[PDB]
Design a protein around this ligand. Structure first.
Ligand SMILES: [Cl-]
Ligand code: NA
Lengths: 143, 143, 147
């Protein structure tokens, strides 16, 4: 896997504790770290939707999580990669949400590779020597 | 019409009442239910932007609604389908906002159908008998 | 330039508490606006919305990061890719983002995501073609004008 993952997680009040949010973000992060990404690429942001602000099927829902996942274009081109990705994220989303009766939905949207920068730097190529330096330092390194 | 609609609606303070948000969400939901979707697919989330956090033309705007509509890719390929969709949403957005003096903007962004799941399930093919079960039960039926 | 400054644009800027002051948010929004205005866009097309993320709601490499800005830039889909024009777009936005964030020790990330022009409307009107006479009317009036 290469490129940015940015997750936005909107949810009802009294649905995820601060500890569950941290746990979820860290399982998301682990998944990408396992694909070889520098961990600091992974951003997960939660937004609690006050009651009155969220509608599913036209009605307020008190127990939902809506995830939007932003990737870069052509980062998971094969059916095998895409299927593997869904397996890997279901492995931590399902066991968190199902015991809570949570209804959840995710989808992945893809963005052009060449318009992404971190601290004003275009990140290095997957597998490159420069990426190993970024991983080691866990920060954007200027060369 | 394939796939999920997820709407994000950002707006200024003192611009939409809780009653107007609920009514808007019901109208959006009715639009997609009329296309044949299960009601529960339709998500609409509002975020009020405090004064000092929203800028249009570089100035704070006290009376705006900014909409982001997330659809699946390849769901409206013909000009006729696309034009019909825009007519159908303008039919409720314009009469709500115009008399209030609101400035509103929407656009539609697209995501691949194969990376979309609800409650850990890939939803049924559009127009399928399996989809009809999801419409009828208004929930993600495991099968 | 060109292909990359046609619109919409919509900027979403998520950030930690006590990271950007209200004055800085306003100054950034004006800088972003001027960048697109310089390429002939009507000023009112440029929307910039900030969302403060409370402590405990933001994770970067698993860290609850207290000093970050995460930007999402929504643009119109392009007919083609141009490295020359793209580099011009990135140079112009880095010219204001970097000087604001770097002296504050902020870690920041942006990317651009694209949307089809034909499903975009402002006040219920499809905006005029990039570079057209109709667009010049919208520039002058700084609002959507029916034809
Ligand atoms: Cl692909
Ligand atoms: Na490009």
């Amino acid at each position: 896997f290469q490129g940015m993952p940015r997750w936005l997680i909107q949810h009802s009040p009294n649905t995820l504790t601060p500890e569950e949010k941290s746990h979820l973000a860290q399982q998301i992060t682990q998944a990408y770290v396992g694909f070889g990404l520098p961990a600091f690429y992974v951003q997960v942001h939660f937004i609690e939707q006050p009651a009155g602000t969220s509608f599913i099927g036209g009605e307020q829902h008190p127990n939902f999580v809506a995830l939007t996942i932003y990737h870069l274009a052509r980062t998971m081109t094969s059916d095998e990669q895409r299927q593997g990705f869904l397996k890997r994220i279901d492995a931590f989303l399902t066991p968190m949400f199902e015991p809570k009766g949570i209804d959840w939905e995710y989808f992945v949207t893809e963005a052009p590779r060449d318009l992404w920068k971190i601290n004003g730097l275009a990140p290095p190529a997957a597998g490159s020597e420069e990426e190993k330096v970024w991983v080691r330092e866990n920060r954007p390194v200027r060369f």
